[PDB]
Symmetry: C2
């Protein structure tokens, strides 16, 4: 619990009161509290009185939140979703699309014929109607149509499955790479392509590419799970799934309700108050600008990842939260600013009604991490956990997703926050006790972004046995010395706060 | 608990973080070395240690100079004043009216025991612990100490009418005790204690003693009460072995004169030059000790709230004392507006078995600085302050911030520059302390009793919080210089203290009590 409740954030103030058995509620503009007798102290009452405006604003936002159950009713309307409009109008149709428009799927199906794989894939496409979307503009109005699943041209090619493991693996890897590198234009007829490689009469390799406007990473996992179930012998039952087209109608209705206005206003106000980070050596604003996207990839192997999970347990927190706090501390140290906003990528599938919905359901949780040099890590961690829970409770689907060229309600454009983090876990099927630190880094070639590029974007996937990371940077905005210092700051934070949680004597 | 900027942590906190990783720093032949698992010390660690090498070596040199167990006290030392007796004598002088804190009273009823048996036991205690018989005088200005004979102690016998009704007898006995305790016991008097037995009846005796504080501390008062109980029990209990304070005094003088002490002195002198200065939040006046009027604000925390405070300290994995110290420091920070609060913590040198049961004056000070930035949380302040208290206790010097000086010194003795003192100790004597209060919902804050002012013509501790944990209750007295702090400053400091106790130690501890809804 903080020392000065008068200057805590409202989420932290409310959480502190919650831990002492005091819960606040808003009804008809009247603010009230429920607690055991004498729990609310005169000092509490003075704080609540001094900060009444902010408290009631926060509570009105909370009243406008998405509440369970999310009840999706079938919709006769076929129209672009709010997020599809944001994507289409922001990214446009450049002659070469950004690589992030394409999401590949690569899966070997031992024992299964190419025809059975293609049949299962086509049935998936027939089932989740959003997969068949096709977009075009008429008079500036974006419109969507559905292809017929029967018309999907699934390609069949062959490879010699009897080749030795050490020639066959590179050949298949090169086939997948070439396939995934082809353009999948946003205005194309189909927003996916599928190809089956027959390794043998009963050995098949599936290669798909889906357009990111229609499919998120969680949906790729859903598609793989549905494939495994359909191709098992005998096939397993398929869990029911709502349709994204129906969700899209529900979401447009939910967003157009004036009841949302307290929530929108809350976020808009918070974003006006966000500080600006600058290059530590350049003083340039770190708001998003065009540039060259360079990816710095690394893998934390099993032993170190296990130490990190142990440290996270000892801090009574998730691995995600520990990593988010280390990232914020690294950014504070690197930038020189003790207040660091971070855009955290999340998944709107947080209720059973949305569990198996195939589509685009990516969202953002924006928090502000405070790392004063006098503080300890666990304290920053605890504060950030509170901010993360509040942000997740108060999610708005369009919030800091894609930038805007116009308009908006002040919550949509993410360009003013330099740093994004995107962490998730995968649990679908190294061990050196001698891993170096820092882990080995591979620097990618630069991808040209003629449009604003996330200045700093840390992607992390926890596979259980390893943690894959990619620090994507605007190599045109950050100097090489700035980039190296940020990498050093990141690895130092990870080591100090998460790794370090026979005896020799040396003179120092 | 690990800080964000190790470059600016205190050395005790830095060493604590490294220890948590199995990294131990040592000093040998002026060379700083480290023991650790083979890949533990990282380049960032090494850069921090190299940049802070001078202060790290100074701290370890202080630690090497520390008091180490065992304390081996040689018996039958020659008789001379202790270092602390000289400090007391020369500081306080012999004013025509002494300060009340010179007198420590003892009041104990011994049902079933005749007056002669009580007097025999008390005299034997006086015969056994020779420092009790000290008497002071000057020879050409040099403080000199001699011993009275225990046989010559004039124990007074008086009577009280034990058959009077309880409501006549109890006030009468309390007035006898109060009058007896109020008489002067001059520092230069022949005896530095006096004893009187009140016969309520031939076999009902009330013992009244007064001891001079230069010779007896509060822990020794408890030791004397325990020894009386042992001596008067049937059958009598063995008496626990005790070293003599006179011999400890010679041991301590030699220990302080050893040149090996110099790095330790040096460390503290340097720490104290760096102490911030606190000022009154409404006056802007320095809160260093000044003459004035001592007013005591007394209160009692009853059983139900004390149990909640103890559960909070258990949940924070700390002692009740550490929790109370951190709450006091946070209150001082909020009240004063200063995020850095020095606190003189009164302690007891009896921390090893060689000093257990030693009757005498063994009071010491542990000085720490509590850092309470408004954005910090309580548990991190608590954890850091624990580290500071452990280091300070390890590096104790008996003369450190005990009594002020008119002259001389080594830069560590005078405590006047620290506004706030805390003095916490525990008692586990059945029936001792405040009346029991087993209400499950006692009011908060506790009722406050303000004493009349005592005139201090010499520098008076500006803020002194005394706390006694009796098990069933926590008795408190906040002693304030009523000439220095305005009434509004005093009220605000008391309110800050009670708010910190409530918010960080009491709250979340109602165990499913009735819920009410109120409009704000």
């Amino acid at each position: 619990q903080g020392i000065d409740p008068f200057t805590m954030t409202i989420p932290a103030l409310l959480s502190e009161l919650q831990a002492r058995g005091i819960t606040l509620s808003l009804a008809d503009g009247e603010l009230s509290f429920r607690a055991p007798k004498g729990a609310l102290t005169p000092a509490d009452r003075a704080t609540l009185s001094a900060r009444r405006e902010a408290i009631v604003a926060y509570l009105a936002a909370k009243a406008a939140r998405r509440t369970d159950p999310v009840t999706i009713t079938p919709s006769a309307e076929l129209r672009p979703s709010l997020l599809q409009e944001l994507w289409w109008h922001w990214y446009g149709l450049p002659p070469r699309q950004l690589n992030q428009e394409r999401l590949p799927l690569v899966k070997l199906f031992p024992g299964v014929t190419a025809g059975r794989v293609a049949e299962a894939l086509r049935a998936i496409v027939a089932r989740h109607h959003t997969l068949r979307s096709s977009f075009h503009e008429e008079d500036g109005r974006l419109t969507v149509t559905l292809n017929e699943a029967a018309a999907l041209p699934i390609e069949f090619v062959e490879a010699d499955g009897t080749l030795p493991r050490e020639e066959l693996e590179p050949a298949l890897k090169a086939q997948a790479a070439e396939y995934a590198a082809r353009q999948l234009p946003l205005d194309g007829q189909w927003l996916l392509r599928a190809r089956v490689v027959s390794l043998a009469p009963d050995q098949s390799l599936l290669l798909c590419v889906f357009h990111h406007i229609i499919v998120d990473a969680a949906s790729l996992l859903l598609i793989l799970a549905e494939l495994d179930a359909r191709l098992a012998d005998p096939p397993r039952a398929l869990p029911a799934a709502a349709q994204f087209l129906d969700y899209a109608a529900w979401e447009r209705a939910w967003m157009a309700d004036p009841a949302r206005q307290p929530l929108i206003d809350y976020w808009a106000r918070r974003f006006r108050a966000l500080p600006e980070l600058v290059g530590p050596l350049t003083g340039r604003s770190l708001a998003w600008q065009p540039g060259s996207k360079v990816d710095h990839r690394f893998v934390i192997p099993a032993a170190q990842l296990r130490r990190m999970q142990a440290a996270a347990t000892r801090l009574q927190t998730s691995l995600f939260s520990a990593l988010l706090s280390a990232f914020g501390v690294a950014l504070a140290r690197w930038s020189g600013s003790e207040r660091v906003p971070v855009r955290c990528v999340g998944d709107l599938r947080t209720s059973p009604e949305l569990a198996n919905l195939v589509g685009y359901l990516v969202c953002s949780d924006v928090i502000e991490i405070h790392a004063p040099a006098k503080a300890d890590f666990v304290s920053i961690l605890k504060a950030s956990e509170i901010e993360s829970h509040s942000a997740m409770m108060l999610r708005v689907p369009t919030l800091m997703r894609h930038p805007l060229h116009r308009g908006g309600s002040g919550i949509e454009d993410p360009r003013g926050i330099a740093a994004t983090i995107n962490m998730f876990s995968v649990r679908i099927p190294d061990e050196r006790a001698d891993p170096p630190w820092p882990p080995q880094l591979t620097r990618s070639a630069g991808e040209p972004w003629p449009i604003p590029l996330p200045s700093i974007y840390l992607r992390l996937i926890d596979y259980g046995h390893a943690l894959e990371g990619s620090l994507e940077l605007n190599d045109t905005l950050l100097t090489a010395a700035e980039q190296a210092a940020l990498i050093e700051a990141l690895f130092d934070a990870l080591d100090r706060f998460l790794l370090q949680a026979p005896l020799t004597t040396e003179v120092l």
